Amino acid sequence: AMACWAQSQGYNCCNNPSSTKVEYTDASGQWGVQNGQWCGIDYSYGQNQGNESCTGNGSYPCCNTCQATYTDGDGDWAFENGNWCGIKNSCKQQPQNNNQ
Incomplete structure (x- = not known):
């Protein structure tokens, strides 16, 4: 954080x-x-990747897929359901702080 x-x-x-x-x-x-x-x-x-938020929340809707076909100045981005959404805050790193 x-x-x-x-x-x-x-x-x-x-x-x-x-x-x-x-x-x-x-x-x-x-x-x-x-x-x-x-x-x-x-x-x-x-x-954290707990899924507290998502990317693209400043214009378009959330995607829900951890496949960022494109990254911009606001993070990663993907295209699902026929809409330009932003990669979820959970779809970035599994070991979010929690180090086994």
């Missing part, structure tokens, strides 16, 4: 980026104030 692109510059990650209010947006990315703290909106800043 710490892989935001905003930190690369100095800022901090915004917890629950899949439900953060982005009152700012430019050529640097999406930013918003969460819990009273500045932080970029990274839906894929290194979360």
